[PDB]
Amino acid sequence: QFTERALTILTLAQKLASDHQHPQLQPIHILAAFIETPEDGSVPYLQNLIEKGRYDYDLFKKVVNRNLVRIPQQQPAPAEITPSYALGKVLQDAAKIQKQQKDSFIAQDHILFALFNDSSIQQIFKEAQVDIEAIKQQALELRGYLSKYAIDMTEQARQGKLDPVIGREEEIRSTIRVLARRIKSNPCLIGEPGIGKTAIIEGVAQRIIDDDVPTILQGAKLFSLDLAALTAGAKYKGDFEERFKGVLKEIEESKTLIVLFIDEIHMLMGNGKDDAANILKPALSRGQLKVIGATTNNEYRSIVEKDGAFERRFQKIEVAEPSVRQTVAILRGLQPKYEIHHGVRILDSALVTAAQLAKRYLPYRRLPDSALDLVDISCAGVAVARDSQNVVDSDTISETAARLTGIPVKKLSESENEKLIHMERDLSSEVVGQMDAIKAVSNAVRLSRSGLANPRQPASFLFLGLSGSGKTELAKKVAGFLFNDEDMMIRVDCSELSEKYAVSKLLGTTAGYVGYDEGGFLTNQLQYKPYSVLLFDEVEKAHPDVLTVMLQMLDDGRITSGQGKTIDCSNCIVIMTSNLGAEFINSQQGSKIQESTKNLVMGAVRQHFRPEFLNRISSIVIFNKLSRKAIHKIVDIRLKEIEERFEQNDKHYKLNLTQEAKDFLAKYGYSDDMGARPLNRLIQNEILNKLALRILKNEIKDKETVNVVLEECLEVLPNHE
Amino acid sequence: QFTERALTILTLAQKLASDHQHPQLQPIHILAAFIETPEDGSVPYLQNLIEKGRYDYDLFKKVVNRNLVRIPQQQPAPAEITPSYALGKVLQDAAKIQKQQKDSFIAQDHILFALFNDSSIQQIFKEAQVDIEAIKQQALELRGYLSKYAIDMTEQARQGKLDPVIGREEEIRSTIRVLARRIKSNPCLIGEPGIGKTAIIEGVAQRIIDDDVPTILQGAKLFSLDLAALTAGAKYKGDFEERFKGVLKEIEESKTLIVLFIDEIHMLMGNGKDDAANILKPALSRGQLKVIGATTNNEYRSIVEKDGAFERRFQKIEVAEPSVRQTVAILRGLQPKYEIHHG
Amino acid sequence: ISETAARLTGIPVKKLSESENEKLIHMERDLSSEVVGQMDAIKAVSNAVRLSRSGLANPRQPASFLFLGLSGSGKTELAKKVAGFLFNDEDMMIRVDCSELSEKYAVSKLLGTTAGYVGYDEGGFLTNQLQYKPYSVLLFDEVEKAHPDVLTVMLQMLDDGRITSGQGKTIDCSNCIVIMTSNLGAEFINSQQGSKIQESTKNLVMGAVRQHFRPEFLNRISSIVIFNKLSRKAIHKIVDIRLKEIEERFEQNDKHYKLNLTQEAKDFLAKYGYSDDMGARPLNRLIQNEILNKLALRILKNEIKDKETVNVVLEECLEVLPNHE
């Protein structure tokens, strides 16, 4: 109800009546409280609403002292009988004043006002008007000041607005050590955004709230300064100093250990300096004016480069991210806040896994926030879904994260079935033979899905064999099964090389040079798409400088960029290709991959491909030769897909191909030295060419047949009508 | 003294005395100043105390006009002699109110009140602005509007004027889930141009309109922000921050919640940062301030590489491209829009 | 002065902690539990940090070593492990991806954008990291493929430990540690003349080092460090370690091996994979390809719900807990 100051003045009125041996309390006794002390700082006595308003404080002093002498000496027992209606009314009026003034507590000024409004000198010896406006003016110009300049974190903390923080006790102590300096009063927190800089300032506030602060700072209070009053609050040229200088001086003395702080101190460098608030502050740094700032490391760098002065006042305080275990500790401290915020229970394992998840899948975010996001997001997820529950650790988190960050890998299937149990079948259905390539694909994904693959390495395989054997097709089909979308594959022509390639590859352009589109094909796409299948079109012909660079993705997945940042791959499957082995494939020694032969190939590949790459690669995969037996399946597969891809079914075929057509293809388009690719030449050269002509001649109205000639031919529906 | 809002009204009042070529400014010119133009945020006329007080502000304007035509002269050379003793009193009364309120400047709120104390309609059943007690009941809702700076997407959606979505419901659900968060409340739609990120934000408006959103977001008023308000409304250093702060404060309190939408985040990020206004939003972003944003993945790149601050305020959401069949579904959803569009 | 300065400037080298028993004295031991063999390499780094902490390191220069030998000999692994030991965090390693480098260099590494040129993100990757983080350890990956102009300018830090940027600012973090790597020596370790590389062979390595790098580098490096091939008993040891580390790292340990590697599983990995030119990585890949992928399937099929074992089947295979145990 009352401020401590208001209570003091009222209390003094009461106790002065006791000390002066006076019966019922009168307006006189509150006036006695007003003149209770010689201290000029006491507004009720010298730096008064009277003295700086309209009348000599002595006039009033003598009104009161005359009256105090005039009231007769009583037995101590009644010395302060009651406030009666007289002081009751003054206090009630002080409350009416609060309502008029919109003041949350009764001020000593409300007591000064209310008393003065009711009061009049009781005797002819002194006269003075109750100059209400003068006393209000003087009251308004005193004490109330920071609500116009900075947000009072400490009182708001007393009011429960503070978020307590843990695990930063040294960082908090560091700000204390700096704040405890006698000369260099200015600390600043420097680090990554999301590192916990504001959190540390609030940590200081927590230290203040629990009064765990050294005498120099023991009475401290924190206030959030800048942008509003320092920028929005400006229309005139001197507005960088009006209000700003004002508050700097308002807080230098008496009013406890006021410490302002800046959360976004980046501004305080000035756009071209020009003392845009920025210089006046350090200009006054020889004393008081204790302020703590906060900036990111790069913003720090920028304000340093753009100023050269605040840095002589401000102590650089480095803030490091916590370890995963430490992150969990803060998560635990924060856990109940989240359970409350969302009305859901959270498992300790939720917190544990959130933190390690973040380390694994959120490289662009710091652990404090990243882990918290996984928690607060999961909780929010449930809060929305709550119309139905609680948060369940990795269950909720893996799904939640995958939904936002990508990586469905962690969701686990409703049924593993086609999801890597029967996948070898499904892959063998799309492509024929080459089961080891198929197994490699499945295994790559299975290890990823199971959390077993070495996390530092993307699945990586190099595919050897004769072009036309399905090496690209495999990669595309992998994307097919990986995303249920074959166009999500990333494919780079790795053979387009000379040394002049930086940006075309993950290296990017370099900032400071023309062009700021970097590694678009790889770096930008990788940043955007957390995983894919990356196909390198004949690494056999790629320049070795690039291959050496690609190695970095191949293993130890970290990826740099000319932007000064990194990408850091993880879950992208990479596929490299070569036909070196064609020199051995053309031996035609069985459809199966032969021992020794395949080794001569891989040996030669190393000779013509840095083994350093191959010494990191998950494995080299070799394709089976497409024997006619393989063809006997492939032809149907391809004719089916080829037809299905032909726009819409306004015609298409009945396809009475039977063995006769199949064999023709196996006897005519079947080049032992070019895989199935020449069968496609046959198919288009014969089947589609005739078809196109029949369509062109409008000899087909709907459907179509394939009729073996002894070659192939088509039928006529309308007779060239 | 007076601030810009009060000065605008006062300026208009004096202008009106000259618009009517009258030697002096009268209370009627001020009442006319209160009702100048149909700009909703004008508390003196439309989003006013009058409507809240159950009065017809246009009828009142007819009253004002009936009084303005009774001005005894419109003689040119005689015009513009004095502000009048009558309004001396009113402006002095405004100063008294400032003292009553501990206010360092006279706002339109105060100048309204002061005239109202001295205003009248010579009518028993006055069609006047609601009497002073109501003036206080509603005037006290002020201090202690966004439509000036943004389009109410939710209201447009309530009025239809919206194109339905398909498939993107999942990123919408993600958006709702992010908005529902206590700390990082801001989802952002990131991806290729043309994917449907605007379509998603309209989809969000639909969910609000359709009551498919939990109460804490259900009542949200979704707005299309900045650009014009940000820069077209600018002239000088700091007035970006002023409009920003104004809006941010509005969304900070009382009106359940307001959600702001930023389509092209690149519009922010200052200029090499330099805290060139943009930063205020991140600065205050901790106070819930539910915001939805968007950006081209490459734009995201060009700003995320530089910023780092907004990243702790928003949730990155990739928006997937629909398959051909899904695309057909959108075409089907929009089919009636197209048939209507061209007949 | 040391403690308060350290809290603000890091400088752990100025602490002189009572924990030296572990904090350097047992460093070689601790590192040998992480790194198999490569005794001299372990000692080389350890020696440098001992001079740092003892105040004997000369402020004019960072610790500097060149790691030569078979890829998969643990060259970058050692470097990471000393980041681990030295700063209690392997991820603090500022690996310098030197082969990822063109003549543009500047920003992506140590110099940054010449001030006044567009892009005010300057030396973000290396210099700014030191600017922000007084010192750490840096690892120069495959310096053989670094652009020559860059190899040359980085010499300003190699000795006369200066770091002048395009920002117009200087860091001079001579307190750091740098490790350079190369596969240059692989051609001589491939002589396979015992597991430990002998004299003459090392001279050939150094011959090649001189062909690749100038005295302007080579005589500034604290030492060239040449890595050995692992002994068959040593790979036995690395196998044990890696298998344990992999499972220990395995996200949530929802599944769990008895890890009955016995002599036999370990021998199968060693015998099946120990080519003298392989590097330890293929043994690690082998177990992933031999068993772990089978495990993944067993998990997916619910053959492994919890726990797991090791079993040896001659050829190799993996047992199940077929009742979804």
Ligand SMILES: Nc1ncnc2c1ncn2[C@@H]1O[C@H](COP(=O)(O)OP(=O)(O)OP(O)(O)=S)[C@@H](O)[C@H]1O
């Ligand atoms: N040590 C900690 N104690 C308590 N809360 C923490 C801690 N670390 C992080 N947080 C959480 O992190 C969020 C605010 O993070 P901060 O690190 O202050 O953000 P910030 O990094 O200060 O913002 P910048 O980077 O200066 S814009 C809050 O929601 C806190 O719950």
Ligand SMILES: Nc1ncnc2c1ncn2[C@@H]1O[C@H](COP(=O)(O)OP(=O)(O)OP(O)(O)=S)[C@@H](O)[C@H]1O
């Ligand atoms: N589900 C949907 N997916 C895609 N587009 C849709 C969808 N529903 C409606 N549309 C319409 O298709 C267009 C999608 O455009 P936007 O979402 O603006 O594209 P964008 O992702 O915002 O990229 P910009 O910035 O508009 S080029 C809009 O003009 C919508 O009217």
Ligand SMILES: Nc1ncnc2c1ncn2[C@@H]1O[C@H](COP(=O)(O)OP(=O)(O)OP(O)(O)=S)[C@@H](O)[C@H]1O
């Ligand atoms: N002696 C060893 N002690 C511990 N780990 C080892 C050892 N040798 C190899 N490794 C493993 O090898 C992998 C890293 O191998 P390194 O030989 O450092 O790679 P690298 O050959 O240094 O890379 P380059 O060739 O310089 S790009 C790690 O996954 C280690 O587990």
